[PDB]
Amino acid sequence: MQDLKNTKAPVSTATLNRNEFDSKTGNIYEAISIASKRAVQINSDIKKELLEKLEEFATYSDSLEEVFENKEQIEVSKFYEKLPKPHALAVQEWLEDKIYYRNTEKDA
Amino acid sequence: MARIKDNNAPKRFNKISIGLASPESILAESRGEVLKPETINYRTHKPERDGLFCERIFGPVKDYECACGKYKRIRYRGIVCDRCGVEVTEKKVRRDRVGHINLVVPVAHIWYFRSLPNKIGYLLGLPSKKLDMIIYYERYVVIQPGIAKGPEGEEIHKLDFLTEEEYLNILESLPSENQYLEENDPNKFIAKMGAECLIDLLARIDLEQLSYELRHKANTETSKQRKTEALKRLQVVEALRESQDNRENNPEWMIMKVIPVIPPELRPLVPLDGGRFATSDLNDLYRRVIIRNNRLKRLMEIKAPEVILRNEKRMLQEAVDSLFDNTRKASAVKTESNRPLKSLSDSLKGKQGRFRQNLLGKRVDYSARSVIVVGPEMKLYECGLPKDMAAELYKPFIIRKLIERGIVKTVKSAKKIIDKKEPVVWDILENVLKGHPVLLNRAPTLHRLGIQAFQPKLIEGKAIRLHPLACTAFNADFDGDQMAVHLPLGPEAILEAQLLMLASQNILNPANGSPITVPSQDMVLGLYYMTKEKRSTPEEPVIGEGLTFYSSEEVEIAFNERKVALNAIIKVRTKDFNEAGELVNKIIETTVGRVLFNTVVPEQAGYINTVLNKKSLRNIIGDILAVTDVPTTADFLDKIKTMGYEFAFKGGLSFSLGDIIIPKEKHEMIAEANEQVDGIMMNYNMGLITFNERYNQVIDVWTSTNAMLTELAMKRIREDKQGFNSVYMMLDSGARGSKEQIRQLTGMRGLMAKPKKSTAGGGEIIENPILSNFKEGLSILEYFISTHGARKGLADTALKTADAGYLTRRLVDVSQDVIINTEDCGTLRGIEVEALKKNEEVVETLGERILGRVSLHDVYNPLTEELILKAGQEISEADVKKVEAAPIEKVEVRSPLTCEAAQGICAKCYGRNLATNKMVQRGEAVGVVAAQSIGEPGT
Amino acid sequence: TGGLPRVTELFEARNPSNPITPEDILAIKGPSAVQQYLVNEVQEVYRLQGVKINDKHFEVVVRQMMRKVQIQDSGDTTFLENQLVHKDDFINENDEIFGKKVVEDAGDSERLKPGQIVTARQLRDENSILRREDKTLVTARDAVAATATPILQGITRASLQTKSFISAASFQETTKVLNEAAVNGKVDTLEGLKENVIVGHKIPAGTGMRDYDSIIVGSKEEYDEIMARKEEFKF
Amino acid sequence: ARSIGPYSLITQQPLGGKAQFGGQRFGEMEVWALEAYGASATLREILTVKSDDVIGRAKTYESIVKGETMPEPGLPESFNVLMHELKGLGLDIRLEE
Ligand SMILES: [Mg+2]
Ligand SMILES: [Zn+2]
């Protein structure tokens, strides 16, 4: 699993160098497609980890109130919220050559 | 309620196939048969059983409720009621279920005997008129002569046309046993009439043999007209034959025994206020068809006389023809208001058809719109977003974060919290906005820069904050303009926006590759003011002139200490390119403001030591992007924007009546022009010159006076305050204003054109120009004169914007299919490009024209034999300089016109992508970019 | 005020009200010369107003403006006199009919009728069979290829004759295009932008090319671990 | 500003106008801009799951709320209407993979 605590991906939108992004494939569109597929995978993994963590801190309350207050759950959710977005993590992985891609049609 | 997972998986497809519809196919797709022409009961507003809106065929009107109300709620899903026959399901099914109409007699589709060319006529070889006589039930035609012979003994041939009397006579002359023969018996005499005859005749066609005979006839016939007709029939038969390998395409399917009925929701019966109903024409046409078919069936059952039966069959054919395409009929069925009814065919063509109305444009969710204000403190990739707009747009993301935080367990409670605008909502929205850009669009979107991606920031108020540098791309000012906000949702869309549509990435103009995020107005004026030099005078000594500095650090120290002026001429030691192109330290005479400007300039660009205007700024940004990457250029743009704004604010540059210096000699030269005009007039009165000559001389004198006055006014304003006059600084920098406008504010508005309606010649020029200017004030007469030109200009713009848009639309339509699909097609053909010269003046240099192209062959220097250009390589700026240094006048480069690609254009023939100053990459929609680039300036 | 009408006239291949017409240049100097003339004229009109647009855009447009040829002799091909066809279709038809034989007189042959285009191998086999049967031999003539001359269209006419039937129906003459497609059984492969916009699929440009749907991605560390495990299991 | 709201009768598109709480119109020229950028996914998402993909829009909203992967776009309702008209006019149209 990725070390989300020590990730170098930018938190917000940043001006990325297009030449570095498409250097490996020679086509910015192919790189964008690969990055988005990896971003979908990263988002799935992050959702699974967050769901497990929330289930660990989930408290069973039988009250019929519409608003609940769980400070530990709120803190965990805030920590996950402050992390970079999945697509930013995918871009950071792509820049660091941490994404493996293969074209099935070209290798057939 | 969570939407039910409709297990009808979205049919994945990459191919669309069309063909003739078999009756069996229509029966297979149909859910039932429509007997009654009634639509609904006028009292209970419920659909009539077996009608055009019946619930047994098309589906229940109410969700999970049958027609009779026996079964209700979702618990009876999939159950068809035994009492009313209506399936218990969703109302949405009333959009997909199709009905059918079982016709008593077959009928031909208008599309295949009225369209040019007619398919049935070319298949059967019959002319259109004869086919019409067949279809509308006029004459019988012999399908099979058999043993029947003419009254005089003449041989009867196939396709022969017989009148009713002739048909009866031939039947009487034949033995009764002939009628009892099977249709496959060659001796049987078969002669029918109408669409039944048409299907019987089409089913007997050997398409292969028909193509054989048509080809042989075309090859052997000596008549040109007959050869052309044979080839034209051959065309239809070969097309229909080529249809067969793809799919079952049988010619007799052109005559339908069954007519399908489209789902009712596509032809709605909408009740209006007051008990009135709004109905589509399609309901009326279908109702007419059922009425006529039922009348034919009844007349068949009662065995009506043959003339009446043929008339009713012809009227059924007319009803079917009208329902398919009414408009082609001369006697089209019309309403009481004489408006022709809209048929099924009319739903497709025209500006209001499906294709151009509901498929090419749409309204979208997750969208917003407000007024735009200037956020000059923002970065190039950031936009300010009002709190309400962000809360509504990002509502489901905020809901997700609320459920994740455990505050609310349901989406309803999350919506309640969001609507109350609690601080936790803002705390979550601040994180949600990060990394999720929005798309800003201003109509009209003339080029692709009309939609750009920005990183949103929460702000106060109800106006969207826009970065000033995006205004030129958006053509947006802050006089009341509005922009639409579009929110991408998926990760692919977000990455697409960030990596292609981000404002920081869109520095270049795709039309030419020049920078489009150039500073303007306040920024340019401030940069010009800071970078301009001031020399010392005894009245106004300049602090710090002549000092030498070890680097920009000491210059900054002195400026902050107020020991040197901003415009002082100083000497500093810093990096600059030498004659060899290397980075060395040298003492260069400069200005403190120029040093401060160079403190933010990227190092690799050298030292910039010129007074900054818009043109020089554009060239500087282009060079900086040439030597560095896009992010560095964006940071440079942000820094110079802030610097220009700050140094324009600090100077307090204003507009006063004292800056508009009307020359004191204005009256004297107006008087001299008046004496010259008087000389011309007295010359005319003595007959020395003609009327046209006097008019031309007077115009020449007045225009010479205007030119001299413009030059004198410009000189006065320029030399005022050593070039630091605010109006002169505004004009010279290119921030705002032109020479003509300053002339009108200071000199004389000059000659004006008459509004006369002369059909032959253009507008004549009034011999008396507008002597007064806007500082002196125009008289009543002069103002009335100028109103003509003002109104003319406004009308011209308002009327020609649409023509420019239409040209853009046509270009996009003609160029949409050009996409870079292959890297190299390997052509040896190219275009020979030379420097563009007009009237002995080089308008475009050879290097500028060949910049970004791919070389055809290798090019060698004729003087030094050095390899300047390699075949198959892009022409970069360094190669441009090398070519300009060498005595080369013509360069052969690969061009789209000479490309040999199978689909679209290859990458090498296109050359450089002007939006990135890099080689074009596979997938670029170069055709749309070309169309937009041509169309935008016209608007 | 006159620049926009001039541009519209140039792009439409319209003869001037006082006729050099592009058709004359195409007839005399050739296709490349007329393409260069059109590009230069349009770019000059745009330049007079102080607007800089690269020549490559006009070149791309003019390429689409010259995608058709006019046939001067049908030969034995499927096409018709004075018909406007795609250059690719003309070349494909000429290549398909090349080297074949058209039956002039069928003689006593039962498998061949007069008027069919047959390959030389088939004709030789049929004549050999007839010779074994001692019957009259089939006489066939060489296939005659069609000839055509390049023509220059306006933007409207060029757009009006697209290959896909969905796009053509969307543009104009919906009835005729739909009729011809339904009779011909035409299959639309969705190769343009207008078609995919209409149907709501990914456009075949930029990110949405068909090659990119076949790409399989994954974590490089995970792939290396999987490969190492596979190698360990192979031992 | 609108995330979701009422939809029209025939086209099933989101309504227009501020009084009806509707979305903005995204027409031909702006689609040309998207095509020029090569923004395939943005154009697909806008043409289907934001305008007239009835199942797609609901599934997309549910996925955004629950944080799941975005469902694949379906057939727009405008294309369904076009296909139904062409079928009612007697032309056999099939979707082939
Ligand atoms: Mg405005
Ligand atoms: Zn090429």
Side-chain angles (χ1 to χ4, degrees):
Chain A
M1 253 194 160
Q2 256 192 324
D3 188 8
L4 296 168
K5 294 181 178 182
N6 292 322
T7 179
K8 294 181 185 180
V11 187
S12 191
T13 302
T15 309
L16 298 161
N17 194 351
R18 287 186 179 180
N19 306 335
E20 272 184 328
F21 198 83
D22 65 356
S23 63
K24 298 168 191 171
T25 55
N27 197 336
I28 191 167
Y29 307 112
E30 191 172 8
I32 287 162
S33 186
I34 295 160
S36 73
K37 293 170 185 183
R38 181 57 189 152
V40 172
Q41 292 171 348
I42 290 168
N43 182 52
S44 194
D45 295 338
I46 286 176
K47 184 194 173 199
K48 195 178 177 190
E49 191 181 356
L50 172 61
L51 278 168
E52 283 177 4
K53 290 297 177 173
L54 293 176
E55 266 190 345
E56 283 183 351
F57 290 107
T59 46
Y60 291 96
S61 148
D62 282 340
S63 71
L64 283 160
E65 294 176 351
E66 288 195 335
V67 182
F68 301 92
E69 209 170 9
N70 189 345
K71 290 174 190 180
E72 295 80 16
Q73 186 182 0
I74 289 165
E75 217 161 26
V76 172
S77 301
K78 278 181 174 185
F79 169 77
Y80 275 92
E81 282 171 26
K82 286 179 181 178
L83 294 174
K85 296 301 188 192
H87 52 263
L89 297 168
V91 166
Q92 187 65 28
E93 278 192 341
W94 178 253
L95 290 171
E96 292 179 9
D97 209 26
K98 287 181 173 169
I99 300 177
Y100 164 75
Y101 65 97
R102 167 182 162 195
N103 195 325
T104 49
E105 282 185 338
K106 283 184 178 173
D107 289 347
Chain B
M1 272 225 187
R3 275 243 188 119
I4 296 173
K5 285 178 184 181
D6 265 336
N7 269 355
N8 291 346
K11 254 185 183 177
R12 286 207 192 184
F13 66 98
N14 34 24
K15 261 196 315 303
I16 285 288
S17 68
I18 213 186
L20 299 168
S22 89
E24 297 79 23
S25 80
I26 295 171
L27 276 56
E29 70 143 27
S30 177
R31 287 284 184 161
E33 171 304 326
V34 182
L35 280 167
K36 296 184 182 175
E38 300 120 13
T39 54
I40 63 161
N41 191 300
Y42 77 102
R43 287 186 179 180
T44 62
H45 292 170
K46 291 188 192 186
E48 278 287 349
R49 191 176 180 174
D50 310 326
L52 286 167
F53 289 71
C54 155
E55 286 176 284
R56 186 176 65 95
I57 326 170
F58 307 108
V61 182
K62 288 189 174 180
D63 287 314
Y64 299 109
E65 289 202 335
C66 65
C68 68
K70 183 181 176 186
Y71 296 105
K72 297 186 177 182
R73 307 159 180 202
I74 199 169
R75 82 184 195 180
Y76 296 116
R77 177 181 172 190
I79 300 180
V80 180
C81 179
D82 35 22
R83 206 181 175 179
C84 60
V86 182
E87 188 184 341
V88 180
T89 185
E90 296 183 357
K91 168 185 173 184
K92 180 197 172 223
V93 307
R94 284 177 128 280
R95 275 178 169 265
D96 307 327
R97 317 222 180 129
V98 201
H100 76 278
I101 281 186
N102 221 301
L103 293 164
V104 184
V105 317
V107 278
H109 198 311
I110 184 191
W111 267 21
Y112 309 86
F113 63 77
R114 278 211 174 186
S115 78
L116 299 169
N118 46 355
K119 312 301 178 175
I120 304 175
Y122 277 58
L123 271 156
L124 295 206
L126 296 175
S128 303
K129 44 203 55 48
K130 284 190 172 190
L131 195 61
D132 285 341
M133 335 200 205
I134 278 268
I135 291 166
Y136 298 113
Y137 282 127
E138 256 68 4
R139 311 224 167 170
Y140 290 87
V141 159
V142 179
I143 297 173
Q144 176 175 309
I147 49 167
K149 303 312 181 245
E152 300 192 359
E154 57 273 53
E155 282 189 346
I156 303 175
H157 300 305
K158 190 180 187 187
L159 286 150
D160 278 350
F161 279 69
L162 303 175
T163 58
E164 183 165 10
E165 284 175 0
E166 287 164 332
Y167 177 66
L168 305 152
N169 287 341
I170 289 164
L171 264 167
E172 281 190 349
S173 171
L174 281 165
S176 53
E177 297 180 1
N178 195 292
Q179 270 192 331
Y180 296 108
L181 291 174
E182 288 213 310
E183 286 196 339
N184 300 338
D185 194 321
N187 298 314
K188 183 182 181 181
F189 171 68
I190 306 177
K192 253 159 289 183
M193 96 166 315
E196 200 167 24
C197 177
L198 282 183
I199 164 175
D200 283 344
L201 194 43
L202 285 166
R204 291 171 179 233
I205 293 172
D206 192 346
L207 288 172
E208 169 49 278
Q209 197 173 10
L210 186 31
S211 175
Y212 278 164
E213 311 180 352
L214 287 175
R215 275 190 193 267
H216 184 71
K217 204 169 169 182
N219 281 346
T220 50
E221 198 88 42
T222 54
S223 171
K224 147 272 306 174
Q225 195 159 4
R226 290 190 190 173
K227 182 175 181 177
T228 306
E229 198 290 320
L231 283 169
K232 280 182 179 182
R233 280 188 64 202
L234 153 76
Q235 219 163 41
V236 161
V237 52
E238 43 84 351
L240 195 185
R241 263 201 29 211
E242 185 29 37
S243 76
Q244 316 255 337
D245 40 300
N246 287 328
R247 48 181 292 158
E248 272 184 346
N249 213 30
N250 298 345
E252 65 301 13
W253 290 2
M254 230 162 306
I255 311 302
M256 319 88 165
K257 295 142 55 33
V258 179
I259 287 180
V261 161
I262 68 169
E265 293 284 346
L266 286 70
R267 42 172 180 82
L269 186 83
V270 187
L272 297 174
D273 293 334
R276 298 188 169 182
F277 286 86
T279 185
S280 175
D281 307 349
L282 294 175
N283 288 320
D284 260 339
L285 284 298
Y286 280 116
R287 189 169 62 120
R288 172 193 334 310
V289 169
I290 324 191
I291 286 165
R292 298 300 170 198
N293 195 52
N294 279 348
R295 204 173 190 185
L296 201 295
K297 189 172 186 172
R298 208 177 189 181
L299 288 169
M300 263 322 149
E301 279 174 3
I302 316 165
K303 185 44 221 62
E306 263 55 51
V307 183
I308 294 183
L309 284 170
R310 285 188 204 157
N311 197 30
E312 206 64 24
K313 286 175 183 187
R314 185 180 65 186
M315 281 205 351
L316 178 60
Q317 172 68 56
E318 287 188 0
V320 175
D321 154 80
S322 94
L323 153 72
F324 283 159
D325 163 4
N326 187 39
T327 47
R328 270 181 184 170
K329 266 196 152 197
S331 58
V333 181
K334 297 177 183 181
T335 54
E336 291 187 356
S337 60
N338 235 355
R339 189 187 77 113
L341 289 171
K342 269 192 172 217
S343 63
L344 277 169
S345 176
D346 301 321
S347 299
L348 301 176
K349 75 211 74 94
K351 275 191 166 172
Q352 303 162 20
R354 289 301 182 213
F355 287 121
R356 285 206 57 193
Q357 190 68 19
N358 305 114
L359 296 166
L360 300 169
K362 258 171 279 304
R363 283 190 182 274
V364 317
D365 286 333
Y366 303 99
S367 182
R369 155 173 271 241
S370 194
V371 190
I372 53 170
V373 292
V374 54
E377 277 44 42
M378 266 174 330
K379 295 191 175 183
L380 186 52
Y381 63 86
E382 293 183 332
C383 75
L385 211 73
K387 283 174 166 174
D388 297 4
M389 204 160 351
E392 185 56 34
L393 286 172
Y394 292 83
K395 183 122 191 192
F397 304 113
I398 301 163
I399 289 164
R400 169 190 168 182
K401 295 320 211 291
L402 292 191
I403 327 164
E404 286 176 3
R405 288 190 182 199
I407 330 181
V408 290
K409 289 182 178 168
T410 71
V411 184
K412 191 180 176 181
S413 304
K415 273 189 174 202
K416 258 184 187 174
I417 279 195
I418 293 164
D419 293 343
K420 283 202 30 45
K421 268 135 200 304
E422 295 178 15
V424 47
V425 160
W426 312 121
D427 202 41
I428 285 169
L429 183 56
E430 201 32 58
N431 298 310
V432 162
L433 289 170
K434 287 176 185 168
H436 200 155
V438 289
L439 311 145
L440 295 184
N441 162 237
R442 180 188 177 267
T445 311
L446 295 176
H447 53 211
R448 80 186 207 176
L449 300 181
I451 307 179
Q452 294 185 20
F454 294 85
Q455 177 54 44
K457 243 187 207 147
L458 272 172
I459 63 161
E460 285 297 338
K462 293 174 165 283
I464 301 164
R465 288 231 178 243
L466 192 90
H467 193 269
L469 289 177
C471 293
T472 309
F474 282 121
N475 201 28
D477 50 359
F478 304 100
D479 66 345
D481 283 14
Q482 307 175 36
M483 299 226 304
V485 162
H486 299 279
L487 180 100
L489 293 179
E492 195 43 274
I494 296 168
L495 280 178
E496 228 147 69
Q498 282 183 337
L499 283 159
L500 306 123
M501 308 150 90
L502 204 69
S504 61
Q505 305 282 353
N506 303 143
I507 297 174
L508 300 176
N509 196 350
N512 36 67
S514 265
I516 203 158
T517 52
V518 183
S520 63
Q521 302 198 9
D522 311 349
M523 303 189 205
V524 168
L525 178 68
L527 292 166
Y528 179 92
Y529 175 63
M530 142 179 48
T531 53
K532 217 189 149 87
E533 62 193 17
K534 200 189 296 133
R535 279 214 148 207
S536 197
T537 57
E539 300 93 3
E540 278 197 324
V542 178
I543 304 173
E545 181 161 355
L547 288 178
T548 206
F549 298 90
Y550 65 78
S551 72
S552 52
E553 194 177 70
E554 197 188 359
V555 180
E556 284 191 3
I557 287 163
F559 180 69
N560 292 331
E561 289 297 317
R562 290 186 145 231
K563 274 319 201 335
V564 69
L566 183 71
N567 304 95
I569 302 173
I570 60 160
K571 289 181 177 177
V572 74
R573 187 180 72 182
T574 187
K575 287 285 190 23
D576 191 28
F577 292 113
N578 55 7
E579 294 181 357
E582 275 45 57
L583 231 48
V584 293
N585 292 12
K586 52 194 233 63
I587 292 183
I588 59 200
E589 190 170 17
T590 181
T591 285
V592 177
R594 289 176 202 168
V595 176
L596 298 173
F597 163 65
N598 279 277
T599 55
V600 299
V601 172
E603 164 32 85
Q604 305 95 352
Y607 190 75
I608 304 166
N609 200 25
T610 56
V611 179
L612 293 186
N613 51 39
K614 219 189 167 24
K615 213 174 317 311
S616 189
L617 265 160
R618 184 154 40 55
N619 288 5
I620 285 157
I621 302 154
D623 297 342
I624 283 173
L625 184 59
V627 202
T628 327
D629 50 24
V630 152
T632 307
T633 310
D635 195 48
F636 167 77
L637 283 170
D638 256 316
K639 267 150 208 43
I640 66 168
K641 148 188 96 53
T642 305
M643 266 183 21
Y645 276 151
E646 163 167 275
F647 278 98
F649 170 69
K650 284 184 166 178
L653 316 168
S654 211
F655 188 96
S656 174
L657 284 95
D659 323 295
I660 322 281
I661 310 170
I662 298 179
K664 311 228 212 83
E665 308 90 350
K666 155 88 149 312
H667 279 300
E668 170 301 331
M669 344 195 282
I670 284 173
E672 202 175 24
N674 273 329
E675 324 328 331
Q676 286 179 16
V677 169
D678 278 344
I680 293 160
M681 253 323 292
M682 293 45 272
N683 284 337
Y684 170 73
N685 287 342
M686 288 45 269
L688 291 169
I689 55 177
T690 68
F691 183 84
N692 283 337
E693 280 169 339
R694 151 265 200 221
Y695 174 78
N696 290 335
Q697 283 179 11
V698 164
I699 283 179
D700 281 339
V701 152
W702 281 117
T703 206
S704 204
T705 303
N706 192 9
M708 217 97 66
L709 181 64
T710 313
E711 220 68 21
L712 189 67
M714 284 303 323
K715 200 215 60 53
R716 289 279 186 171
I717 295 196
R718 182 186 305 174
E719 322 278 53
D720 184 49
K721 308 191 32 203
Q722 311 194 12
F724 282 82
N725 181 289
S726 306
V727 176
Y728 180 72
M729 267 171 24
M730 282 144 180
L731 166 61
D732 193 52
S733 68
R736 216 73 172 275
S738 84
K739 187 169 210 201
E740 282 69 32
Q741 294 167 343
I742 275 43
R743 175 256 265 120
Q744 297 182 50
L745 300 186
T746 283
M748 42 166 29
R749 223 188 195 280
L751 296 165
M752 296 291 294
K754 288 183 177 179
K756 275 186 169 183
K757 297 180 175 187
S758 65
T759 39
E764 287 173 353
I765 271 43
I766 305 172
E767 71 214 45
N768 297 324
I770 295 181
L771 269 42
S772 267
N773 48 54
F774 287 107
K775 189 178 174 176
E776 291 163 353
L778 308 177
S779 70
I780 311 163
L781 214 77
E782 298 166 326
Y783 217 86
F784 183 74
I785 291 163
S786 38
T787 52
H788 296 273
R791 190 170 287 190
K792 240 158 281 172
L794 283 132
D796 281 34
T797 293
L799 285 179
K800 298 195 170 179
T801 299
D803 288 337
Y806 182 57
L807 173 57
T808 304
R809 184 162 261 101
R810 278 182 288 162
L811 281 171
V812 173
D813 267 321
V814 85
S815 308
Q816 58 164 15
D817 65 324
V818 189
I819 300 162
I820 300 297
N821 267 328
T822 326
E823 292 44 32
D824 198 355
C825 69
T827 166
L828 307 168
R829 290 187 176 186
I831 286 194
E832 217 246 26
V833 175
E834 59 184 7
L836 216 59
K837 299 182 186 195
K838 191 186 178 154
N839 290 359
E840 312 190 1
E841 270 169 357
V842 152
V843 190
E844 263 274 288
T845 64
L846 151 65
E848 249 208 291
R849 282 176 129 238
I850 70 175
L851 189 168
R853 303 276 193 150
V854 173
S855 188
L856 209 60
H857 334 277
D858 297 340
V859 202
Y860 299 99
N861 194 338
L863 290 169
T864 61
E865 296 185 358
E866 193 180 1
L867 178 68
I868 300 182
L869 284 133
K870 230 177 186 181
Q873 196 171 355
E874 183 195 341
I875 306 176
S876 71
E877 297 193 40
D879 307 313
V880 161
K881 285 181 181 177
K882 294 144 117 213
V883 170
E884 281 164 313
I888 305 170
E889 212 258 14
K890 303 170 162 212
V891 177
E892 300 205 71
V893 278
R894 298 180 67 169
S895 164
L897 287 151
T898 60
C899 188
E900 293 175 6
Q903 285 178 344
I905 303 173
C906 72
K908 308 263 181 133
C909 281
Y910 186 49
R912 175 177 280 187
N913 189 356
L914 297 175
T916 63
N917 273 304
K918 277 238 165 150
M919 266 270 321
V920 66
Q921 293 184 351
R922 182 198 182 245
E924 199 91 21
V926 294
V928 182
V929 177
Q932 291 173 334
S933 301
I934 305 163
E936 196 233 332
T939 313
Chain C
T1 58
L4 189 76
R6 186 41 217 251
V7 167
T8 298
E9 168 128 44
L10 270 175
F11 270 104
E12 259 311 317
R14 228 81 73 64
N15 265 28
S17 53
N18 212 19
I20 303 175
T21 77
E23 284 90 357
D24 290 319
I25 300 169
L26 172 57
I28 297 161
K29 300 185 185 187
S32 190
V34 81
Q35 288 178 338
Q36 293 292 253
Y37 167 83
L38 287 172
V39 166
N40 285 334
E41 277 285 323
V42 177
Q43 187 72 297
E44 166 35 20
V45 178
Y46 266 97
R47 167 167 15 270
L48 269 166
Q49 299 290 343
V51 174
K52 279 193 171 200
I53 311 169
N54 198 297
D55 293 345
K56 58 179 56 191
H57 307 310
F58 305 111
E59 291 173 11
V60 165
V61 152
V62 171
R63 181 190 186 249
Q64 296 307 296
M65 277 195 4
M66 276 225 62
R67 277 301 99 176
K68 324 214 61 62
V69 291
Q70 186 173 6
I71 279 178
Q72 284 188 336
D73 155 22
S74 265
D76 80 32
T77 64
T78 302
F79 306 131
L80 174 277
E81 193 35 74
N82 329 313
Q83 184 182 356
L84 296 172
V85 292
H86 271 87
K87 188 134 30 178
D88 309 331
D89 300 336
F90 157 103
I91 286 168
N92 285 340
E93 206 82 6
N94 267 12
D95 286 348
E96 216 189 14
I97 72 153
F98 182 77
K100 294 186 181 167
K101 298 246 181 199
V102 183
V103 175
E104 285 191 332
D105 197 354
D108 298 328
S109 181
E110 293 189 356
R111 297 176 186 169
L112 297 207
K113 296 333 150 283
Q116 159 150 287
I117 305 181
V118 291
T119 61
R121 190 171 152 137
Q122 280 165 322
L123 196 298
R124 225 180 301 177
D125 292 342
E126 200 76 6
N127 274 342
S128 176
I129 292 163
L130 291 171
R131 261 181 182 175
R132 204 292 313 134
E133 294 185 350
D134 208 343
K135 288 180 178 169
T136 326
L137 290 171
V138 176
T139 48
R141 62 178 182 83
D142 289 324
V144 186
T147 202
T149 41
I151 214 55
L152 204 176
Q153 315 189 285
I155 52 178
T156 308
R157 305 221 37 66
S159 34
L160 278 168
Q161 295 182 353
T162 166
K163 295 203 155 194
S164 153
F165 77 93
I166 301 178
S167 186
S170 73
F171 196 35
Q172 284 187 352
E173 325 78 8
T174 316
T175 316
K176 143 90 160 132
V177 174
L178 279 172
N179 256 334
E180 244 299 326
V183 167
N184 193 159
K186 280 192 181 170
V187 165
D188 204 326
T189 41
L190 303 180
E191 290 183 352
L193 298 179
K194 214 147 164 64
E195 308 85 325
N196 283 282
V197 165
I198 282 165
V199 201
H201 274 8
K202 280 202 320 302
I203 56 168
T207 279
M209 319 253 268
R210 315 299 144 182
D211 322 88
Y212 301 161
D213 291 334
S214 39
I215 279 179
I216 295 183
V217 308
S219 173
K220 211 171 185 178
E221 288 174 355
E222 280 182 330
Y223 178 78
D224 288 341
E225 271 195 346
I226 289 164
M227 256 327 265
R229 280 186 184 180
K230 254 181 179 179
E231 283 188 349
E232 280 184 341
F233 271 106
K234 268 185 175 183
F235 275 102
Chain D
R2 166 185 169 140
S3 52
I4 54 168
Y7 312 82
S8 174
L9 192 161
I10 296 187
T11 56
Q12 283 291 25
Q13 273 159 50
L15 285 173
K18 185 183 177 184
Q20 293 85 14
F21 194 67
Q24 302 310 313
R25 177 144 200 169
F26 194 174
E28 207 170 7
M29 306 192 89
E30 294 79 22
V31 168
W32 302 341
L34 278 184
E35 290 169 350
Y37 273 132
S40 76
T42 312
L43 189 54
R44 176 154 84 138
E45 225 185 10
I46 281 149
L47 293 176
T48 79
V49 301
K50 295 184 186 168
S51 193
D52 50 341
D53 186 7
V54 181
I55 279 309
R57 74 177 137 231
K59 248 47 181 313
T60 292
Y61 191 86
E62 191 58 0
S63 300
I64 290 166
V65 167
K66 231 69 56 180
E68 285 125 37
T69 64
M70 312 262 102
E72 73 299 332
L75 289 167
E77 212 90 355
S78 52
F79 186 65
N80 281 335
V81 172
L82 176 71
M83 260 195 324
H84 270 310
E85 285 179 348
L86 281 166
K87 282 186 174 199
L89 198 173
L91 307 176
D92 187 20
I93 283 182
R94 326 177 272 251
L95 318 183
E96 289 174 21
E97 205 165 20

